[PDB]
């Protein structure tokens, strides 16, 4: 499925603030957490597992990009798909979303679907 469909919600002007790397179910994963640039709004946690769902082949192309935007500190748009993970405690700690894209953002407009 495409990233910016009508079923995948997105969040604009997000700034990646944390990053956790680990392993679950014999497959590496990573979770980010983004607070808005202007400080307002609630954080948006979104993970990504290596080989669990239909979003598997886009793992390494995203981990290298989610780590880039972390080092700089630039505003990004983030696409997520709600309610993918069904793990007992993994859902309660980080989130149940699924990272499916990191569109870079300019001052006014953001380059990416919506």
């Amino acid at each position, epitope marked *: 499925e495409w990233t910016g469909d009508n*079923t995948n919600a997105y969040y604009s002007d997000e700034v990646i603030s944390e990053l956790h790397v680990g392993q679950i*179910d*014999t*497959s590496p994963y990573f979770c980010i957490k983004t607070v808005k640039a202007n400080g307002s709004g609630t954080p948006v946690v979104a993970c990504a*597992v290596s*080989k*669990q*769902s*239909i979003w*598997a082949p886009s793992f390494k192309e995203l981990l290298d990009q989610a780590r880039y935007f972390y080092s700089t500190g630039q505003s990004v748009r983030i696409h997520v798909q709600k*309610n*993918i*993970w*069904t*793990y*007992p405690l993994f859902v309660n700690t980080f989130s*149940a979303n699924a990272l499916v894209g990191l569109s870079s953002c300019s001052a006014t407009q953001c380059f990416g679907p919506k």
Partner: antibody
Amino acid sequence: VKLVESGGGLVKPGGSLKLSCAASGFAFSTYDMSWVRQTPEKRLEWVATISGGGSYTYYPDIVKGRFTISRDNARNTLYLQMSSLRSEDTALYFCVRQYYGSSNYGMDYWGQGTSVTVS
Amino acid sequence: DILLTQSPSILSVSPGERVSFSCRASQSIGTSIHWYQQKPNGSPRLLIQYASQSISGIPSRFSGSGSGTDFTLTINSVESEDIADYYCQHTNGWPYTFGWGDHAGNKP
């Protein structure tokens, strides 16, 4: 066909079986799969569910310890091993694909359905 | 657990008319309820997931809806090929209790 569900035609009340449900044409490492039963009254009921690799497994309240769902990647099988079959549990026993891999969405294309019977 | 009440159990409708099932849950589910279609002597297939989102490859005549404790499937224009059983899925938690299943009877 992508789903075969081979195994199980008749077992005395207390024996055991193993239902394969071999897959053909999708990423079997992903796509958390599970089992779903019918009934002689045509009412579907849940049986089991296995995660991606198999480290996570769930069962309903009616079934705990009798059924055990497995998963053998590199061969694309499920191998539901039954045990202590009561007078009930005479059903079709489909296996599903859990559309998008997640277990929170639904069931993609189902199988053909075996026929277990206990008498 | 959570029980799903699929009332009524039969829908005798002339072809070419909108039908509406009814799947009232016991506990508030929110929007995690799905629908299937099992023709007689066959394996079911997904129609609408999350009670609002359809699935590609499905004829657009099916249009689910509902939120809270009242969820319904609205086939806008029935045909003589829609005589099948329509079940309810539930995925708020374990276990995944199905529904009863209704028929779409078409009498000439």
